[PDB]
Tab-separated table of C-alpha atoms in Angstrom:
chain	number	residue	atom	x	y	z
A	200	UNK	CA	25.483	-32.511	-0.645
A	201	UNK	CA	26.316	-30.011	1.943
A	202	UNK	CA	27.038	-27.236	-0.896
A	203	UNK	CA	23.548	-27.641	-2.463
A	204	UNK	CA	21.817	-27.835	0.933
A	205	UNK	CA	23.594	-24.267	1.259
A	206	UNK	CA	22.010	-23.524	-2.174
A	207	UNK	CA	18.708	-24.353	-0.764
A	208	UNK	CA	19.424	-22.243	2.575
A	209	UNK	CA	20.579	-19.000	0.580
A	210	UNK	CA	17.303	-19.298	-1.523
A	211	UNK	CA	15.033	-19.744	1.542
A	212	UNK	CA	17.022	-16.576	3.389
A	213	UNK	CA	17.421	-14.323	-0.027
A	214	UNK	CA	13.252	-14.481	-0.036
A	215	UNK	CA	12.665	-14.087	3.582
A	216	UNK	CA	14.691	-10.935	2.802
A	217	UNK	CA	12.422	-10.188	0.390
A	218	UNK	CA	9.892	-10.653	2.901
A	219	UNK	CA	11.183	-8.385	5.054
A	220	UNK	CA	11.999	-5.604	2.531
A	221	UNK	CA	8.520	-5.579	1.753
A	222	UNK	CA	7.134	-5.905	5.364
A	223	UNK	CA	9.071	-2.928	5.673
A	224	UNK	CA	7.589	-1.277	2.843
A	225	UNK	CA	4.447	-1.504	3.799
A	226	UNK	CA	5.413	-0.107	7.235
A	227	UNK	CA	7.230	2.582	5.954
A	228	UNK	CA	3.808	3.349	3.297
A	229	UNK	CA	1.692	3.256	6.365
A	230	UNK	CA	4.637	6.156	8.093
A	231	UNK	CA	4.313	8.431	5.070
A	232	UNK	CA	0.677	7.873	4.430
A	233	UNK	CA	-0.359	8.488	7.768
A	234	UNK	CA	1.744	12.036	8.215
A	235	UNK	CA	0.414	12.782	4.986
A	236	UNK	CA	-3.646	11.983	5.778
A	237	UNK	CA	-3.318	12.711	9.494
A	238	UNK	CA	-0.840	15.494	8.738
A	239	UNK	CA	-0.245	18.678	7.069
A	240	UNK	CA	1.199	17.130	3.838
A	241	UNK	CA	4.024	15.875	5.379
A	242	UNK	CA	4.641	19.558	7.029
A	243	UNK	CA	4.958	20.191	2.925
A	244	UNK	CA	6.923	17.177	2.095
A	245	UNK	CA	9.817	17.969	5.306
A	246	UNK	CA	9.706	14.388	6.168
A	247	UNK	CA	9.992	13.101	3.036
A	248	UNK	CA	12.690	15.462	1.404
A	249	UNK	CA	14.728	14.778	4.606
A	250	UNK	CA	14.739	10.786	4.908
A	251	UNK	CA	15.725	11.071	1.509
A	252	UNK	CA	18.151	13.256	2.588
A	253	UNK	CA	19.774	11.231	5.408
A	254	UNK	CA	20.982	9.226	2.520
A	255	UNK	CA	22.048	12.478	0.463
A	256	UNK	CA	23.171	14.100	3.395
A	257	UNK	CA	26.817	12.548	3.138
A	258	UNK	CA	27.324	12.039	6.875
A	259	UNK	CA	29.558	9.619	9.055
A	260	UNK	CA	28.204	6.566	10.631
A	261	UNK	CA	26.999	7.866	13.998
A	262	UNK	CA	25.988	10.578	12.756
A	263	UNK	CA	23.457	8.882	9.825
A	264	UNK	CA	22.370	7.026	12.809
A	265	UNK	CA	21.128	9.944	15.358
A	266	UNK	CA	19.528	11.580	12.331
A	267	UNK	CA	17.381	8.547	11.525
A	268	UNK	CA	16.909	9.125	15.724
A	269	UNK	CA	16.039	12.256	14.817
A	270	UNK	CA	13.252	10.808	12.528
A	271	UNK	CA	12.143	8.429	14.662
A	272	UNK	CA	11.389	10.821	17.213
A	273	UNK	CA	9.677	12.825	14.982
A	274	UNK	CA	6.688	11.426	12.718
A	275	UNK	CA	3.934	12.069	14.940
A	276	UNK	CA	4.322	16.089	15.305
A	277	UNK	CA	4.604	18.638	12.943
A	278	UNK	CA	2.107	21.331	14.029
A	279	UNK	CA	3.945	21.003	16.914
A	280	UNK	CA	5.048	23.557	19.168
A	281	UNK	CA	9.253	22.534	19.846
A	282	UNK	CA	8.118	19.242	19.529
A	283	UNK	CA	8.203	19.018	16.371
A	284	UNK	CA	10.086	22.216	15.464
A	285	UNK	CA	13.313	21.334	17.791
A	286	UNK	CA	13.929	17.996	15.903
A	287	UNK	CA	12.935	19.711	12.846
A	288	UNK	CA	15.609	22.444	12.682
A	289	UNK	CA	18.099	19.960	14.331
A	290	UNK	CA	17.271	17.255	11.071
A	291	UNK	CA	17.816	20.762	8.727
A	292	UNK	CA	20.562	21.978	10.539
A	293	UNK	CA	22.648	18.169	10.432
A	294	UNK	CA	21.661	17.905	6.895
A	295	UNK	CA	23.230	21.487	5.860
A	296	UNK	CA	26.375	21.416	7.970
A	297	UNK	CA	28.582	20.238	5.395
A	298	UNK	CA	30.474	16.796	5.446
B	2	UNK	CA	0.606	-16.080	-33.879
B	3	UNK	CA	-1.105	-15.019	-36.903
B	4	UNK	CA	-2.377	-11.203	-36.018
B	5	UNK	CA	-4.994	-12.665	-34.002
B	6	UNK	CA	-6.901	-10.097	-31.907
B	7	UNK	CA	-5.233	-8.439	-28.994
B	8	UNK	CA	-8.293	-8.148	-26.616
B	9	UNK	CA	-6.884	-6.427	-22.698
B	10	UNK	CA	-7.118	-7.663	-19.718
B	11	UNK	CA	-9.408	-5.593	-17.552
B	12	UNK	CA	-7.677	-5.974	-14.047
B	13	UNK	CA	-6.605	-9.643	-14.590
B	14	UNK	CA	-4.404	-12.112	-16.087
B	15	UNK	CA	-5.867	-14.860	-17.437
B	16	UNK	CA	-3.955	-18.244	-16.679
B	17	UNK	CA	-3.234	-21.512	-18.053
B	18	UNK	CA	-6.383	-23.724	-17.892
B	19	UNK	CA	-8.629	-21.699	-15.664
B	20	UNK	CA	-11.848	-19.341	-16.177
B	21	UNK	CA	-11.911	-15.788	-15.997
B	22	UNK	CA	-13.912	-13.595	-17.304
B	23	UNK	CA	-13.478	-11.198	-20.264
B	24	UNK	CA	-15.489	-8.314	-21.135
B	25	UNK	CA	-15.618	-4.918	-23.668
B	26	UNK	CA	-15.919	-1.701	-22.563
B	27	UNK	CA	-14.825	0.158	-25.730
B	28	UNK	CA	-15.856	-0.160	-28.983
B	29	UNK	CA	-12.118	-0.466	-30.178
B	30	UNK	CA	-11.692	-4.373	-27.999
B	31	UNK	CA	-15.547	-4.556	-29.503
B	32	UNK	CA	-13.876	-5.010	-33.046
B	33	UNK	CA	-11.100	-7.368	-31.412
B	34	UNK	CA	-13.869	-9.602	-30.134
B	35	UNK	CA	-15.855	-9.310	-33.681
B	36	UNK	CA	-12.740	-10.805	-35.434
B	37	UNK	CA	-12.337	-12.735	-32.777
B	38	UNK	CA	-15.924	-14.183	-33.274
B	39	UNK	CA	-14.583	-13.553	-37.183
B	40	UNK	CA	-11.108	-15.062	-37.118
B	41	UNK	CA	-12.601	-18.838	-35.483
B	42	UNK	CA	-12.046	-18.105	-32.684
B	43	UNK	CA	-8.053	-18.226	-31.016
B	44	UNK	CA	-7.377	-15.231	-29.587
B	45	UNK	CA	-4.264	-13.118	-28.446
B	46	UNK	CA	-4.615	-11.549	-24.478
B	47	UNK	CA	-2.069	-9.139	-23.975
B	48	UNK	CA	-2.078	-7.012	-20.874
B	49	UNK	CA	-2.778	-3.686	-20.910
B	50	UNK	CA	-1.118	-1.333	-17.800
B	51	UNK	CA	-2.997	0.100	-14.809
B	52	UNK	CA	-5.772	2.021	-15.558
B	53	UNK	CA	-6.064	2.111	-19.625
B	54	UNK	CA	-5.761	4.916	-21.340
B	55	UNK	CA	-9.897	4.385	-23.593
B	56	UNK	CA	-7.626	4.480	-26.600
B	57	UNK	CA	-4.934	1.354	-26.307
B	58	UNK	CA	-1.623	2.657	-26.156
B	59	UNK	CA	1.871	1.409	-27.846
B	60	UNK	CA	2.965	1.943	-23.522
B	61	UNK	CA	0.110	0.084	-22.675
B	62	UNK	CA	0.864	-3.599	-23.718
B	63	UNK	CA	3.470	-6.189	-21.741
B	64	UNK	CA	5.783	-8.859	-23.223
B	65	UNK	CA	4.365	-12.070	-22.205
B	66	UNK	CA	0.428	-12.675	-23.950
B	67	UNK	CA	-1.584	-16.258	-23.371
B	68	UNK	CA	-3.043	-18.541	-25.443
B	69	UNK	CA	-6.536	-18.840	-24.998
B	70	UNK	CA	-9.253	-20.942	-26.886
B	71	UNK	CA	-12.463	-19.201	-26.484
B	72	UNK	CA	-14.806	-21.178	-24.283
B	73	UNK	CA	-18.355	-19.236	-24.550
B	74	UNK	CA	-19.452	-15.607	-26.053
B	75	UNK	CA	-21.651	-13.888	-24.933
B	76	UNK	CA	-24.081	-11.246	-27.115
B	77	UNK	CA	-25.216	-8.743	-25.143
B	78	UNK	CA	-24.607	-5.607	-27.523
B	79	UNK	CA	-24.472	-2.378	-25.703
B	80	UNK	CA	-20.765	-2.215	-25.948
B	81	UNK	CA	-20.415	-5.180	-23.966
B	82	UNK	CA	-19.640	-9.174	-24.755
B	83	UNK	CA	-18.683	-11.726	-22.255
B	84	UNK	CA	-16.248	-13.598	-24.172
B	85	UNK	CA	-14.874	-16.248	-21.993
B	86	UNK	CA	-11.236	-17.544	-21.882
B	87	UNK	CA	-9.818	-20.624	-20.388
B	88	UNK	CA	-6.588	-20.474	-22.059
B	89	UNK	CA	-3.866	-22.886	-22.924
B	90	UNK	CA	-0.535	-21.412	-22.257
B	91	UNK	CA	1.353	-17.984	-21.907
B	92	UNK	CA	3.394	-16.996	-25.037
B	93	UNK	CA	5.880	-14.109	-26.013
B	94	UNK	CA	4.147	-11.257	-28.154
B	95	UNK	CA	6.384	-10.859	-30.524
B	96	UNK	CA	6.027	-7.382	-32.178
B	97	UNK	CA	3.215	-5.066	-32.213
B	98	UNK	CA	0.950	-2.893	-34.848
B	99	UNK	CA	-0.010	0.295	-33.686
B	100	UNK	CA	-3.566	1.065	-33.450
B	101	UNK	CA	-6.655	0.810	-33.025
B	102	UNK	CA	-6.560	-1.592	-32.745
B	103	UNK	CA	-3.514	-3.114	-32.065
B	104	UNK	CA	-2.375	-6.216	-33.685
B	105	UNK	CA	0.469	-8.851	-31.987
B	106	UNK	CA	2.230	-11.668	-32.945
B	107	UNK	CA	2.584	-14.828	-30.288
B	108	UNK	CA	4.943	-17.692	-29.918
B	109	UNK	CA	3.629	-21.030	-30.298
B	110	UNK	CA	1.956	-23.481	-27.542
B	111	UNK	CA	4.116	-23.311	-24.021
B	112	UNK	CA	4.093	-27.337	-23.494
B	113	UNK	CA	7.260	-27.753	-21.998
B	114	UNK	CA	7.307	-28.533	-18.419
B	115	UNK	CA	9.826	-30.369	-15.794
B	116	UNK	CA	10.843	-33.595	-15.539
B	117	UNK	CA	10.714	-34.863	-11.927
B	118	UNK	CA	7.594	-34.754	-11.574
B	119	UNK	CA	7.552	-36.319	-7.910
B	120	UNK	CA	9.671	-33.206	-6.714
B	121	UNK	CA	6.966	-30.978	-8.710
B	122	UNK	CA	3.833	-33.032	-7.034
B	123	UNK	CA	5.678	-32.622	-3.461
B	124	UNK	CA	5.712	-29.039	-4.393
B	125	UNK	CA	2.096	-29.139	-5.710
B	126	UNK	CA	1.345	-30.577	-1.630
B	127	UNK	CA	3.433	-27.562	-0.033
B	128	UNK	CA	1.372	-25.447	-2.289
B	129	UNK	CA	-1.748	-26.465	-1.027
B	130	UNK	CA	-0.796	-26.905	2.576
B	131	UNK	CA	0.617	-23.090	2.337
B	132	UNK	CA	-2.706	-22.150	0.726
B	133	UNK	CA	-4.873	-23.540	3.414
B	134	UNK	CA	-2.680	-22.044	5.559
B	135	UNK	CA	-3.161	-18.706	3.600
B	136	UNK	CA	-6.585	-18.437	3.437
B	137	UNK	CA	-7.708	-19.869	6.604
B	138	UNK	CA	-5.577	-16.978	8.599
B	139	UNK	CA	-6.390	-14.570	5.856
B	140	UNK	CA	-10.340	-13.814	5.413
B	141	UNK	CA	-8.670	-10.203	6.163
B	142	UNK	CA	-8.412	-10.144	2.276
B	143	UNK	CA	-12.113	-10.917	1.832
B	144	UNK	CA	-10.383	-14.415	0.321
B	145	UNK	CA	-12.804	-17.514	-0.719
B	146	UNK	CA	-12.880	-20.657	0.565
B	147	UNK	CA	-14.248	-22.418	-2.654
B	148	UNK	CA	-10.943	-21.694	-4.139
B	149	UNK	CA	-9.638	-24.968	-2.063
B	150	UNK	CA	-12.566	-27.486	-3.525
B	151	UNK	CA	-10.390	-26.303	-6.985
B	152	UNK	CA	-7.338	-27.264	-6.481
B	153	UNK	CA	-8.269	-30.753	-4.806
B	154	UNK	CA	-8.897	-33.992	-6.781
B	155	UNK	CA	-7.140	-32.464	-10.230
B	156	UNK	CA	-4.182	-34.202	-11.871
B	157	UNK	CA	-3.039	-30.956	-13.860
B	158	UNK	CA	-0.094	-29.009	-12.079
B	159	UNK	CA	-0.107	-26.726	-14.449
B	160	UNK	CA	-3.754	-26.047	-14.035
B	161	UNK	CA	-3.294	-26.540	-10.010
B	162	UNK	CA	-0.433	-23.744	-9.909
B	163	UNK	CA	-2.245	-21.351	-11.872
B	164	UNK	CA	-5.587	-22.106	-9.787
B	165	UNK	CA	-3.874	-21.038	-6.037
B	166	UNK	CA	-1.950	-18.125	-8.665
B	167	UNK	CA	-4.561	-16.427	-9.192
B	168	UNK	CA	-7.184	-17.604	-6.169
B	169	UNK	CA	-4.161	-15.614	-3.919
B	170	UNK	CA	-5.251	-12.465	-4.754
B	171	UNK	CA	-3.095	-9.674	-5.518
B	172	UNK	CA	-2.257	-7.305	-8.038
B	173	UNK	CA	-2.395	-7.315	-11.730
B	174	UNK	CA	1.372	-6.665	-11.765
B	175	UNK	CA	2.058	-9.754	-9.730
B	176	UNK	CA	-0.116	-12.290	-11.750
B	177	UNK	CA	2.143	-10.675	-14.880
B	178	UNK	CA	5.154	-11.589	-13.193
B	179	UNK	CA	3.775	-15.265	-12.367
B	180	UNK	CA	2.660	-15.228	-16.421
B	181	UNK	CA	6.690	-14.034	-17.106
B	182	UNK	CA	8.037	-17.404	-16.269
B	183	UNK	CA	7.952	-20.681	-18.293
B	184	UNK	CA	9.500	-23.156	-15.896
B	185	UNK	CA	6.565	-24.880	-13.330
B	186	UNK	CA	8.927	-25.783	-10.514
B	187	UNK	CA	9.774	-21.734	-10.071
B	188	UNK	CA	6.377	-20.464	-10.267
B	189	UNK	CA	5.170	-22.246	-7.187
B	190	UNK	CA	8.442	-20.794	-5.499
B	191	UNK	CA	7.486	-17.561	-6.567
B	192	UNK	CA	3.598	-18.163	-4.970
B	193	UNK	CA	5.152	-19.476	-2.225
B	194	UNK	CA	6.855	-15.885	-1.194
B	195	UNK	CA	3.966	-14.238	-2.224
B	196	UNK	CA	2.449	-15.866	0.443
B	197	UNK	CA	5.253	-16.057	3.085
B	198	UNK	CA	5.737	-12.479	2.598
B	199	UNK	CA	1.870	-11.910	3.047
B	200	UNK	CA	1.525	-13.973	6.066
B	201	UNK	CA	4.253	-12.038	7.113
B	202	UNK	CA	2.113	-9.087	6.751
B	203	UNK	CA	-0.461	-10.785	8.873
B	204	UNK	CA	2.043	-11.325	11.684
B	205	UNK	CA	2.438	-7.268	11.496
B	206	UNK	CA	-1.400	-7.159	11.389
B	207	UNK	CA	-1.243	-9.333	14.991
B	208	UNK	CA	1.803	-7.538	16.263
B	209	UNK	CA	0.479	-3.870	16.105
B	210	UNK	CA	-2.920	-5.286	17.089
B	211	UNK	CA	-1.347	-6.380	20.241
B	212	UNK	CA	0.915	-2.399	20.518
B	213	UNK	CA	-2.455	-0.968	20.244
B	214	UNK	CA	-4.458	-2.707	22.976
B	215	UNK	CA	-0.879	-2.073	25.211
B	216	UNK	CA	-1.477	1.899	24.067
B	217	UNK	CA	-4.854	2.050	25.569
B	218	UNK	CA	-3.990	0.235	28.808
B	219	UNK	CA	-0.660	2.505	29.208
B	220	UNK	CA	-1.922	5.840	28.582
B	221	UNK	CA	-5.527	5.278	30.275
B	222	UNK	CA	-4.005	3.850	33.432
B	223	UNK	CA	-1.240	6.336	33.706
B	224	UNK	CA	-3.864	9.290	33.210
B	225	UNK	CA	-5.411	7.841	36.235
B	226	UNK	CA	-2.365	7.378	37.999
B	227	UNK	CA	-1.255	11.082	37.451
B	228	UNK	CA	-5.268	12.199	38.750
B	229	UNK	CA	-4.610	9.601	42.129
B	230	UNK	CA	-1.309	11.444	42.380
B	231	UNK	CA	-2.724	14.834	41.752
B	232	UNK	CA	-5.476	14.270	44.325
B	233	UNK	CA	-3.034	13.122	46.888
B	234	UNK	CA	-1.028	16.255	46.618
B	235	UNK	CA	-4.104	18.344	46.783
B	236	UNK	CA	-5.306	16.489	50.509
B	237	UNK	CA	-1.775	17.210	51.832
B	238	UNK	CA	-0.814	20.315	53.351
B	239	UNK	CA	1.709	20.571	50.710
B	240	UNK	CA	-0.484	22.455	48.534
B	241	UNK	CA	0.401	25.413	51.576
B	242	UNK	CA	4.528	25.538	51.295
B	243	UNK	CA	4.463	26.151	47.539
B	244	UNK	CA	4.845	30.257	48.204
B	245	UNK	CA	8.445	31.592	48.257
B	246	UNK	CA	8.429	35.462	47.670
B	247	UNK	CA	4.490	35.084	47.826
B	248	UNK	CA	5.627	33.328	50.891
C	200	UNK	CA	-39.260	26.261	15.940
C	201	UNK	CA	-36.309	27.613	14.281
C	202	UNK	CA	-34.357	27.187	17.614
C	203	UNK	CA	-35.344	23.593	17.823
C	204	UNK	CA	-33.736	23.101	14.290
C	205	UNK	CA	-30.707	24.854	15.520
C	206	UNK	CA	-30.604	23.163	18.563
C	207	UNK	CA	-30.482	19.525	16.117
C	208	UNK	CA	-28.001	20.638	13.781
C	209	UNK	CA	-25.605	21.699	16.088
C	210	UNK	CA	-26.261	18.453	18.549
C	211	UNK	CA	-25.531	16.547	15.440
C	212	UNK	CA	-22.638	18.860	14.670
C	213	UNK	CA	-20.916	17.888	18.030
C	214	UNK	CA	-21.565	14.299	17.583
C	215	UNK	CA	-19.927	14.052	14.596
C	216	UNK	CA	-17.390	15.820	15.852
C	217	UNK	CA	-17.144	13.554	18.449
C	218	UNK	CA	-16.856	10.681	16.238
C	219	UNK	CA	-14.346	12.232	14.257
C	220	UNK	CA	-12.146	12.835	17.757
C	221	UNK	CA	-12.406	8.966	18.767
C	222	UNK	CA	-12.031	7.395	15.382
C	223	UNK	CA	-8.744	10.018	14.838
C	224	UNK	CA	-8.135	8.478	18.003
C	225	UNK	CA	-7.794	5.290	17.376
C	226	UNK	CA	-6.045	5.803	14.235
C	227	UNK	CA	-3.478	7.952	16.112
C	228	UNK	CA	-2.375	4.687	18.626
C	229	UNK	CA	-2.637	2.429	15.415
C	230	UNK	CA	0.270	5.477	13.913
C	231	UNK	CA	1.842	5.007	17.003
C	232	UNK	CA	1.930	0.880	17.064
C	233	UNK	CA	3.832	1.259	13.591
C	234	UNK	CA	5.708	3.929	15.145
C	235	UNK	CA	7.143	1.662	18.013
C	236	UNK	CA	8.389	-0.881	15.735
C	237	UNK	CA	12.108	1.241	14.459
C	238	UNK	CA	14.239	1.763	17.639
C	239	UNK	CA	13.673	-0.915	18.627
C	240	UNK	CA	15.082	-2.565	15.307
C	241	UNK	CA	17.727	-0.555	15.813
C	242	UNK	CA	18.180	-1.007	19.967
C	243	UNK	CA	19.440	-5.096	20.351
C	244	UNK	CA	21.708	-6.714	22.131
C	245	UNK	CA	23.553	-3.783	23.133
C	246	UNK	CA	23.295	-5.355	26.572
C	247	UNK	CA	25.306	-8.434	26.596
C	248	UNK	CA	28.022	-6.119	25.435
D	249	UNK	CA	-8.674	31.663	-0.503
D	250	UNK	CA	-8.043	28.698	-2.775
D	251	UNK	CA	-8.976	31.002	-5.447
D	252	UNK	CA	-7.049	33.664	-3.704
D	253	UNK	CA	-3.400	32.830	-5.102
D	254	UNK	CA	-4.353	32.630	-8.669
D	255	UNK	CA	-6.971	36.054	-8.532
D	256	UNK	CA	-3.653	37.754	-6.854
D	257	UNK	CA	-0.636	38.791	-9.191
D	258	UNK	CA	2.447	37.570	-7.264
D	259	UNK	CA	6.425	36.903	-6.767
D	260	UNK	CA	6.974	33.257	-8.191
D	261	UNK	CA	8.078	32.609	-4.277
D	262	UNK	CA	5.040	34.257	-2.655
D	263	UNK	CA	2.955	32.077	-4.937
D	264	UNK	CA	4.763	29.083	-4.221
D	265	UNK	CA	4.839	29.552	-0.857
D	266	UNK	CA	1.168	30.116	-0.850
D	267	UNK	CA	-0.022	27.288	-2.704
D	268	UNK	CA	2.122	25.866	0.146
D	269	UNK	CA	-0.541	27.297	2.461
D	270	UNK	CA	-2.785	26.550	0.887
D	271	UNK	CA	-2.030	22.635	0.808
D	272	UNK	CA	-1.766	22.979	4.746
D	273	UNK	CA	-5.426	24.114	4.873
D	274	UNK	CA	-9.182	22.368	4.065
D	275	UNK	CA	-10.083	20.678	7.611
D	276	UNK	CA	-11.061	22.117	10.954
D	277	UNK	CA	-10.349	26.238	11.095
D	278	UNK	CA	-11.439	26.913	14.632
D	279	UNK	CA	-8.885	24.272	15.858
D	280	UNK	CA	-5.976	22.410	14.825
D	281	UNK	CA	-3.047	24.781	14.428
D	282	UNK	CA	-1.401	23.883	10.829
D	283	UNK	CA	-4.799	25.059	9.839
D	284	UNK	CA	-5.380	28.289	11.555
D	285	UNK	CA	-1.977	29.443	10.817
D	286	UNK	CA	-1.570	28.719	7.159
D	287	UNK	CA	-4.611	30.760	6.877
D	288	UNK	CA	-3.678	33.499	8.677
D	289	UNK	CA	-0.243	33.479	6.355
D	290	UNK	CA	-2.348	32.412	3.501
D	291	UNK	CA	-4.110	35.844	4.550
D	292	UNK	CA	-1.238	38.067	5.111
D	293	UNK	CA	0.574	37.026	1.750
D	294	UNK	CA	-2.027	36.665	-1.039
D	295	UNK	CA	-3.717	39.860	0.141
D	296	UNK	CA	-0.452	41.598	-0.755
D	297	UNK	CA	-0.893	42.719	-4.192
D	298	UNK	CA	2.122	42.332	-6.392
């Protein structure tokens, strides 16, 4: 009894991370679309090429987790003057300092 | 089953025991519905991908077709003929002949259901309480409210799970994946996420809603605290000491 | 006449360019209310600790 | 200058780089500085001949 009331627990919590996943899809499809309609194509693709890079990037733990820091921060300025160029060449710089 | 016509499915799938439209808009699904007017009418729906290519493809078609008995047919011959469908069950196309047009083979009747049926009925309830739920929170999705006089005072599940299926609107892709399974007590579990995951969405909708009224009260009343600061400094005699070597 | 006409299209130019600065507006705080929702994700119950 | 890049004989990098420019352009030109500036380099690289 217990064991297939787990059953039904892991089913219920398996889809609400599906719900989440895709919660967070939609959020992170709103991110992209946005800096690309209401920006310069993604300052030609930066964000994009460098999110996927955070993964690519191999890094250590702390480190993975300032650099999606460093993408947080940024997202709203790339025509910027430092503002978005300081956190710019700090995400390129941490992604080409090998690890 | 018996090459009957493969005629697409513009933008829909059509379910179990529910209307839905079906229309051509080529002259190549024209000669499906002519044998299909010509064959006595038992037709094959397989769906076609997102946006067709105006020839069907060999990429275009999907595994799972449905059985559909041909309710009415319309003639209205410009390239156009609303042939009906409110069809019986899904089935596996089998192979495929490459066109045009293409030709498909179909397994037989899906009559096989669940036993339990109490369990399924209970299910059948959550279903409709998570629908009204649904669709009284989301009008966002320019969702009906005539959809919920259709699912109440019918003895069908089968016809009740594939009316809140497709009266939850969503993509083609989605409705494919509902016409993948053949069980009924996993579908509704499956339009059950749909939905928690969707009212999910509207919780987002509410919580940015809520961000973006805080956004205009914090940056409107702290530009007008930095002008009462900024006019404060300018009445002092403050606005004197700032000179060092112009001092 | 002519500087009438002028005078129209460019008050009309300016009030579409107004429009376009509010409604950009309003899109960039609706960015910005997706924008909020990461760090803190990421910042919880470092406190208790 | 859309038509600019492909009336221009270039480097495979100066094109690229200029259909880069390119992309960054097609919205306000007296403001909005992603816009001024990839015309002015859209400008000072496509009128190079090559």
């Amino acid at each position: 009894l217990e064991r297939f009331e787990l059953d039904k627990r892991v089913a219920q919590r398996v889809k609400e991370q599906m719900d989440t996943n895709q919660r967070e899809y939609y959020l992170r499809e709103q991110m992209k679309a946005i800096q690309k309609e209401l920006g310069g194509e993604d300052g030609l693709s930066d964000l994009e090429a460098l999110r996927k890079k955070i993964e690519e990037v191999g890094m250590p733990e702390a480190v993975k987790t300032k650099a999606l820091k460093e993408l947080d921060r940024l997202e709203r300025m790339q025509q910027g003057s430092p503002e978005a160029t300081v956190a710019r060449t700090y995400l390129d710089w941490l992604t080409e300092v090998p690890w | 089953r018996l090459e009957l016509p493969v005629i697409p499915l513009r933008n829909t799938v059509i379910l179990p025991h529910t209307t839905t439209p079906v229309d051509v808009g080529r002259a190549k699904s024209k000669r499906a519905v002519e044998e299909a007017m010509g064959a006595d009418r038992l037709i094959f729906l397989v769906a076609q991908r997102d946006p067709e290519v105006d020839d069907p493809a060999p990429d275009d078609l999907y595994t799972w077709g449905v059985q559909a008995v041909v309710k009415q047919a319309m003639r209205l011959p410009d390239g156009t003929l609303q042939v009906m469908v409110e069809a019986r069950a899904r089935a596996q196309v089998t192979d495929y002949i490459p066109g045009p047009y293409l030709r498909a083979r179909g397994e037989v009747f899906s009559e096989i259901f669940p036993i339990d049926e109490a369990v399924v009925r209970v299910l059948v309830e959550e279903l409709k309480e998570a629908f009204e739920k649904y669709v009284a929170n989301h009008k966002s999705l320019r969702l009906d409210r005539y959809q919920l006089e259709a699912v109440k005072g019918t003895s069908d599940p089968a016809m009740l799970a594939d009316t809140i299926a497709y009266h939850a609107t969503w993509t083609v892709a989605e409705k494919q994946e509902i016409l993948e399974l053949t069980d009924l007590e996993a579908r509704l579990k499956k339009v059950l996420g749909l939905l928690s995951r969707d009212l999910e969405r509207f919780e987002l909708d509410k919580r940015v809603a809520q961000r973006v009224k805080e956004q205009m009260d914090t940056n409107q009343r702290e530009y007008y605290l930095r002008e009462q600061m900024k006019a404060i400094q300018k009445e002092l005699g403050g606005e004197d000491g700032l000179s060092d070597l112009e001092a």
